């Protein structure tokens, strides 16, 4: 859906996206290493 956001929130939403990409990245790397083993 669509909403217009304040300044404080968009920083919060920007970071939580940054966390998840890193979290997927760190989680995504671990699986092939054990898969390779």
């Amino acid at each position: 859906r669509a909403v217009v956001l304040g300044g404080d929130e968009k920083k919060a939403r920007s970071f939580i996206q940054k966390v998840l990409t890193i979290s997927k990245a760190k989680d995504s790397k671990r699986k092939e290493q054990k898969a390779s083993q």
Binding site: A2, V4, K10, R13
Partner: peptide
């Protein structure tokens, strides 16, 4: 749910 969301009138 933030993924369900899309921002508008960005400022």
């Amino acid at each position: 749910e933030d993924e369900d969301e899309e921002e508008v009138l960005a400022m």
